[PDB]
Structures are given as structure tokens and as C-alpha cells.
Amino acid sequence: LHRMKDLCRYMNNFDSEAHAKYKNQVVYSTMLVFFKNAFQYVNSIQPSLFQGPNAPSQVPLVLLEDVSNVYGDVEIDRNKHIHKKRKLAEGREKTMSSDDEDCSAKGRNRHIVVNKAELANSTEVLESFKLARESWELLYSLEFLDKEFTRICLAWKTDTWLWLRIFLTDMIIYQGQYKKAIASLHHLAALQGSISQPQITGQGTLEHQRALIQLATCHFALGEYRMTCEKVLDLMCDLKLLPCTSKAIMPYCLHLM
Amino acid sequence: MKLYCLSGHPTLPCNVLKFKSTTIMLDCGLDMTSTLNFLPLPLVQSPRLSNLPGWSLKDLDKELKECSGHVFVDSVPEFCLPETELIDLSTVDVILISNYHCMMALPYITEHTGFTGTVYATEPTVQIGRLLMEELVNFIERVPKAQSASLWKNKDIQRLLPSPLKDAVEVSTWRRCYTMQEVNSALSKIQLVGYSQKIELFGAVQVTPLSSGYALGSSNWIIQSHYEKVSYVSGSSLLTTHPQPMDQASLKNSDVLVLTGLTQIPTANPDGMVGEFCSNLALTVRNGGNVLVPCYPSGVIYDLLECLYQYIDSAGLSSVPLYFISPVANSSLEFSQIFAEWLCHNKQSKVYLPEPPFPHAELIQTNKLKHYPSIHGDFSNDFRQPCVVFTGHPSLRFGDVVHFMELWGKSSLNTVIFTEPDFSYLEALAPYQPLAMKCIYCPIDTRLNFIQVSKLLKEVQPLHVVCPEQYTQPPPAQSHRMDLMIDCQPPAMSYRRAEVLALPFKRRYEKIEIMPELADSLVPMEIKISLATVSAVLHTKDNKHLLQPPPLLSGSIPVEQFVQTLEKHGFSDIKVEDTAKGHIVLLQEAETLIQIEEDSTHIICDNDEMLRVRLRDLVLKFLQKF
Amino acid sequence: KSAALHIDLCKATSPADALQYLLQFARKPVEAESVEGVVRILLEHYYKENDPSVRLKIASLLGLLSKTAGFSPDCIMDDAINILQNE
């Protein structure tokens, strides 16, 4: 989680020959961090797509905006609440829609206030979840890792690929770009319903509802309250507390509003 | 937690509860009212029924017959079974029979459905049910009729038929009468149980029949798993009946009280109707007419027979004969007599001194009541015209009652008196409507009415109540009587036919036994209350759990007490680091470390193994496992 | 019928109405050649359905259909074992 602070501390655009060992080590560390973040995101947010035909095919979860952080006293901003909400959510870094890549520095600008019982771990799990954006940004800083990530996203069909779609959804959720999350929600209905693999099929899909809730949260962070309310109504029919079931997604939609 | 209701008939329920590891069938029941749609079976082929005009439609005609506007079926009567295909009856482990009325349809379940479980019932219930199936099979097979009628069962054809035939439901599931081989086979799979007898079902649940007071051998059942109890209240009575009264006390502390067998015609007081029945037959007999009383051979016949024995002496009608015609007549009278210990305290006290309990033995001794097995035997020699006859099925579709209705139906002097409320007396009387016979409806239902069941509910206080949906609404005839309802503080959830109810009585804390050997090694503590820790091996046999002898910790370790108390309990050279909301303590021997969080502690060892166990044990001085 | 059963099960309410329709359908027999389509629809609705009683009735029905005439059930045992594993 914090090991990316040392790999990224070296020269990003270093010499290919003079610093061949350093560049290779940085690229390998960046690739490993990106793979770990993608696996964690897929496990946490894509429980149906990560399960095979004979697997349980559980209801997938999703990550929401840090509304509790704004409400909490840790991030109690007296004059950074109306216009800075998008800034507090994304850090003004993930301007572009990065598929299978997270270009955000929100991990260092703020933190996740998670207790011992609220999350799995107050030191390991929370830091690993928060540092995914920072590690991915560090990987994107290196030319080789960024090129590899772009090639993987292009070749793997990131909209169709489970891990890349989960990474894109998490990035859009933190970025506040509700359009990407809405597109993912639309694709998560037909992709899950037309596939012979075991998952949530039809319009009443847990992954689609979770993606819709994430899109509503992103719209609320972006300031489009009307769009967020519409997305929340459609769904109803760094860290946050939310169950993986589809039933709990409906009562959590109004939190962002 | 679950309840599969296989019959929509209120007084003839068939409910299966997938509760714990056993699925128990509560009653079987046979909806006999389907027979009213068919033409009656006569003992001798009558000219009136044979020459009835067929019904006309645009298409058939010989299957259906019309009599005085009503349209019937010219075929053998059929019986509406409980829904057998909703749940695989092979999975049913136990069947509990409450009444002999609910005992019917049991041959279907036991033989045709691949049921291999057990049947539990009380002995009077078994004997009287045996008599009922005996007489039913005898009536049906006496003069057999073919089953040619099948076109009218079609879904698109039944819609255009008139109301009694159109409103029939589950017509495709109707079956002809079971044969006597099936009856004998079914009653062989039965276990006789006495009242308050604890029967263990695979070591999981305990069932006891409790006296309901409605009939001889009538029983209510309570199923319990030592923490959750389910009470089944079938037909019961709180009147002064012969059987011992309701055991209302044992129904208390019930998580779920499934409630069936409530009275039909709730507005009727049974004593007043018994008096009216006696007065009506006395009036008919005084004018020289005959009286026909369709009844079951062993049901309410005994009570009205007692009242008639009392009434005739004052009425000066001892001369007239009291005929009781049924194939199981003598068996019914003898079984009613011998079950003396199954009576109330008043009538079971007749066993001390030598005297039969029921008084109709005196009716026989003085030659007042005369029972016969049929019409063709000695009855046709001893028949005197101004008489009263108890016979046949109350459905008026088979038995000797058909013959007597066809015989006495042409004269206004004779009367037919209906006492069983389970059959619509206008619908049972439909294939004979243009008669001049005086028809009287004074049903005698001693079952619980809604005031009585309301009082019983307030006495018992069950957490949840299950009843047929017919009792959650006023009856359609009245449709405005809020008193004819089941009013409960909970909503008192209901069911219809083939409905599955997910009961909310799911509870934890199943019971387990710990042997003295392991209890010797178990020692309690003190907390804030006693508590202990158990590490053992679990042995399960016949769904009974035994604990054979082979993370969390709790206590009060604040930062101040942590720093002060264990400061010098055996080590030395200890420093305290000024950490926020706590203190960090580490030693210089090998950088061994102890860190505390809010309401938590943990020990770190750095390149040291021998001292780590003692480090943990030092903190375990005042740490419990709460 | 295949499409009729499909649309009826789609439009019926999940807990009780679908169960009643399945109860009605189980009584009437099915022609052997049409067994494949109806069991495919039943499997699809099994995947859709969340209620346990309705899924139980679907399992019982599609087991009943395998006894119908000289129908060859070797094409309907992979999905059966699959849903059994997932159940």
C-alpha cells in the first residue's frame, strides 16, 4: 500500500540503459500494484462477474462517495462544501475517463476515517483500498507501466472485461463522472443477462443497481442534483459503509443527496 | 418456519409444516362437497333420476343432467382431494390426525402418493374413521356407476356451465372413492396414541395429542422443539359434551397457533337447534308423517339421540320406532359404548358402578332404538310407517338416504331434518327439488364459534395465529358481522388453498446436554454476571446433541492501569512512549513491544520466543472472554 | 405450449401466482418433442426466481416432464446438474 511511495520516488522518465535495473524494478512494481488493485476492486465490487457458472454468483457491491467524510468532523470544511465537493471527491486529477486506470491523487490529499469494526482492518485493508488510486497514478507516471495499462485496456475489451470494468467504475465513482458509471450500469445489465455464466440476470441485476447508485453518487459529487436524483430513482425501482445486496442499494441512494 | 396448506376447506384442513428437520402433515381431510355436483347414487334405479332431461349446449348432453334448473353430472360422485402435487408427499415424515372427519383422504395419501412415513392418531378416532370409510366404500360400491363424465372438466367448457358447476374448483384433481383394500392398507400404517402422550419424532420434535372435547378421540396437537412450540387447534368444543373438555392450558407459550376446524353457521346455538330438531320431528310424527335424519353413523347422532330419549317420554311418543340404518350401525353403537374412559368426569364416573356410559343401551333394551345394517334385511319386516330414520350420507348422494328421499319425497306429511352443517342443505337437496317433503335445516355444530375462540386466544396469547382466510373475513351470507371474525393483536396471518406461509418463528438457541465429566473441567468467572469457556467435541445421535470432553477477550485494562499495574511484574528497563489516546510500551532486550488500542491490546515479539508466552500470560491476569 | 407458458410465468407475480400457474401446468401432459422448449423456459425462470417454493415446484415439474413418453433427457442433464450445483 505504501510501497508505491518509494518506487515512484525515483526518476519517472529515467534512462533506459543507465537505469535499466531501476526502470525494470519500477515497472514490475507498478504492474504488480495495478494487478493487486484490479483484483481487489473486482473482488469487492464485482462478485457476480468474478464467479463461474457453478459458483455462488453473489450480489456485487459498489463504492460510493465519501459523504460520511464531509458530514464527519475530520473533513469539516467551513467554506469548501458547495463547489469543493467535486474537488474533495476527485482531487481535480481524473479529468479524463481512464478505463482500467486510476489517475487520482486523493489518497494523499485526504484519508479514510474507518474504525476497528467499521472496516476489516484499520491499518491494512483501509490503506490498501485508499492507495489504489495513488499506486495507479504512480504507475501511469512511468511510461512503460502506463503503456502496458493502456494496451491491456484496449486489448482486453475493458467494458466487457470484469476487472477492467470494476476499475473503471471505481475510477468514475471517485472522479465524479456520472456518464461513465451510467454507461457501465447500462452495459452491466445486458452483459450479465445475455451471458450463460451464473450472475444477476435481467433488469433487476445487483451489479447494475450498484453501478446506478455509484452513478448517482458521482452525479451528486459533480453538482448535478437533478441527474443524481433521477439516477437514484431509477436505481430504486475513500471508504464508505454499504452492503453488497441490491436491497440495501435503494436506501443508500438518498445519502449523497 | 414454513407451512404448506394443501386444502382451502376450513373445517377439512391439510397443512404441512417444514419446521426443523421434519415435515409434519396436520390432518388429511376430504372435501366431500364436490359430491353435491353429481347425481345421487340410488340403491334401486329410480324412474325420476334416470329420465331426467339432459342439458343443452352448442356442441356434452349425456354427461350433464338438468333437474329443476340446476345442472348435475350423470356420473359416480367424486371427492376433491388436498393438493398433493404442491409438495412431494414422499418427504412427509409424520401425519397427525385430529378427528375422524379429518381422517378421510388418508388412503389417497398413504397409497397413491408414495408416502412412507408414520401416522399418529387416537384410538377412538382410528376406529370411528374406520367405520366412516367402511360405510363410504359400502355406499359407493353398493351399486357401482361408471365415470364416463370427463368433457365437463375441460377448462374452456366449465366456464359456460351454470353457477354450482362453474364455481367448482380443482375439478381436474377430483378422484373416485378409494377401494377397501386401500382403506385397510392405510389403517395398517397407524400408531395409536393416548392423550398427553409424548411422541418423539427422530429425537427432533415432540408431539402430544390434547383432548379437544369436540368428538370421541378428537385431539389438538402441540409440536415443540424445546424452545419453539407450534400449537394445532383443530375442531374443538367447550360445551358440556361427552368427551373430556379442552386442555386449554397446554396451548400456552405457543410461538405459532395454527387454527382450523371452527364452526360453520356461527349464529346457531347448538342447544336451541337440538330443541328445535326434537320439536319439529315430534310435530311431524304426531301428524302421522315420517322423519328422515341424514347423519353420520357416529357423529352428532349420539347427542340428539340422548335428547330424543329424554324428549319422547314427556312427549308421549314412545310407541314410534327409532330406526338407525347403516352398514356400521352396530359397530358405531358398540364403539361409542366401550370408549368410556375417553369421556368427561361426569360420564366416565359410570365405570365405577356397573353401567354403560351412553343411555342408548337403554333405548335398545326397551326396544326404542332399532339399528339395522341395511334396508333389505330385517328392517323391511319390522318397518312401521310413522317412524324416524337416521341413515345415509348427509351429502344426500349415496346411502339409504337416497332411497328414503325418493320414497317419502312425494308427500308433504314426511320431513327431512338436516343436522350436519358441512353440506349446503339447499345444494344437497338440489337433485330432488320438486318434492313436497317438508325440509327443515337445524344444524348442530358444537365446534368453537368466534366469541369462544376470541376468549381462548386472549387466554392463551399466542405470538402468531394461522387460520384459513375464510375466518379473516365475515361469512359471505352475512358480510357485515364484524363479530364473526378472528380479532388478534397481531394481524393473524391467513392462508388459501396451495399457499405457502413463511412463518417468522425462526429462533436460535437449540438445546444441548453437557455431561458431568466435561462440567467438572468447566469453571465459571465473574463479569459485568457469570461466564465460562468451553472447548469440547460435539457428538450427535438421533438429532440429540451431546458435548463430550476431548477469538475474543474481555476485561478492564485502561491505559493508566496498563502502565501502572504490570510495570514491574518480572522484567526491567521499560520505557513508555507518549502516544495519543494510549501508551506504547517496548523493552530494550530485543525491541519486544506492547501496543494498546481503545478497548484492545496486543503483544509484539521481536526476535524473541521464550518470553512471549509469559508476556501474554501477564496480561491474562484480569482478562476474561466476555 | 412454450411461448404461452413463458409469457404467463413472466407476467405472473413471483410468490403465489407463478406457483398456481405451475400447479395448473403440471397436471396437463406435454408432448415429447415440445419438452425441450418448456424445460428451457422453466430453467430460465428458475434462474430468475428467488422464492424457494416456486423453485421447488419448478424442480418437481421438470422432473415430472422427464417421464413423458419416449422423450430423450440426455440433452437436459447438464443444465440440471449445473442448477443443482448452484442451488
UniProtKB/Swiss-Prot annotation, chain A:
<comment type="similarity">
    <text>Belongs to the Integrator subunit 10 family.</text>
</comment>
<feature type="modified residue" description="Phosphoserine">
    <location>
        <position position="97"/>
    </location>
</feature>
<protein>
    <recommendedName>
        <fullName>Integrator complex subunit 10</fullName>
    </recommendedName>
</protein>
<feature type="cross-link" description="Glycyl lysine isopeptide (Lys-Gly) (interchain with G-Cter in SUMO2)">
    <location>
        <position position="180"/>
    </location>
</feature>
<feature type="modified residue" description="Phosphoserine">
    <location>
        <position position="98"/>
    </location>
</feature>
<comment type="function">
    <text>Component of the integrator complex, a multiprotein complex that terminates RNA polymerase II (Pol II) transcription in the promoter-proximal region of genes.</text>
</comment>
<comment type="subunit">
    <text>Component of the Integrator complex, composed of core subunits INTS1, INTS2, INTS3, INTS4, INTS5, INTS6, INTS7, INTS8, INTS9/RC74, INTS10, INTS11/CPSF3L, INTS12, INTS13, INTS14 and INTS15. The core complex associates with protein phosphatase 2A subunits PPP2CA and PPP2R1A, to form the Integrator-PP2A (INTAC) complex. INTS10 is part of the tail subcomplex, composed of INTS10, INTS13, INTS14 and INTS15.</text>
</comment>
UniProtKB/Swiss-Prot annotation, chain B:
<dbReference type="InterPro" id="IPR048660">
    <property type="entry name" value="IntS9-like_C"/>
</dbReference>
<keyword id="KW-0832">Ubl conjugation</keyword>
<dbReference type="InterPro" id="IPR022712">
    <property type="entry name" value="Beta_Casp"/>
</dbReference>
<dbReference type="InterPro" id="IPR001279">
    <property type="entry name" value="Metallo-B-lactamas"/>
</dbReference>
<protein>
    <recommendedName>
        <fullName>Integrator complex subunit 9</fullName>
    </recommendedName>
</protein>
<feature type="binding site">
    <location>
        <position position="506"/>
    </location>
    <ligand>
        <name>1D-myo-inositol hexakisphosphate</name>
    </ligand>
</feature>
<dbReference type="GO" id="GO:0005737">
    <property type="term" value="C:cytoplasm"/>
</dbReference>
<keyword id="KW-0963">Cytoplasm</keyword>
<dbReference type="Pfam" id="PF10996">
    <property type="entry name" value="Beta-Casp"/>
</dbReference>
<feature type="cross-link" description="Glycyl lysine isopeptide (Lys-Gly) (interchain with G-Cter in SUMO2)">
    <location>
        <position position="58"/>
    </location>
</feature>
<dbReference type="GO" id="GO:0034243">
    <property type="term" value="P:regulation of transcription elongation by RNA polymerase II"/>
</dbReference>
<dbReference type="GO" id="GO:0032039">
    <property type="term" value="C:integrator complex"/>
</dbReference>
<keyword id="KW-0539">Nucleus</keyword>
<dbReference type="Pfam" id="PF16661">
    <property type="entry name" value="Lactamase_B_6"/>
</dbReference>
<comment type="subunit">
    <text>Component of the Integrator complex, composed of core subunits INTS1, INTS2, INTS3, INTS4, INTS5, INTS6, INTS7, INTS8, INTS9/RC74, INTS10, INTS11/CPSF3L, INTS12, INTS13, INTS14 and INTS15. The core complex associates with protein phosphatase 2A subunits PPP2CA and PPP2R1A, to form the Integrator-PP2A (INTAC) complex. INTS9 is part of the RNA endonuclease subcomplex, composed of INTS4, INTS9, INTS11 and inositol hexakisphosphate (InsP6). Interacts with WDR73; interaction is required for the assembly of the RNA endonuclease subcomplex in the cytoplasm.</text>
</comment>
Swiss-Prot record, chain C:
<protein>
    <recommendedName>
        <fullName>Integrator complex subunit 4</fullName>
    </recommendedName>
</protein>
<feature type="repeat" description="HEAT 1">
    <location>
        <begin position="32"/>
        <end position="71"/>
    </location>
</feature>
<comment type="function">
    <text>Component of the integrator complex, a multiprotein complex that terminates RNA polymerase II (Pol II) transcription in the promoter-proximal region of genes.</text>
</comment>
<comment type="similarity">
    <text>Belongs to the Integrator subunit 4 family.</text>
</comment>
<comment type="subunit">
    <text>Component of the Integrator complex, composed of core subunits INTS1, INTS2, INTS3, INTS4, INTS5, INTS6, INTS7, INTS8, INTS9/RC74, INTS10, INTS11/CPSF3L, INTS12, INTS13, INTS14 and INTS15. The core complex associates with protein phosphatase 2A subunits PPP2CA and PPP2R1A, to form the Integrator-PP2A (INTAC) complex. INTS4 is part of the RNA endonuclease subcomplex, composed of INTS4, INTS9, INTS11 and inositol hexakisphosphate (InsP6). Interacts with BRAT1; interaction is required for the assembly of the RNA endonuclease subcomplex.</text>
</comment>
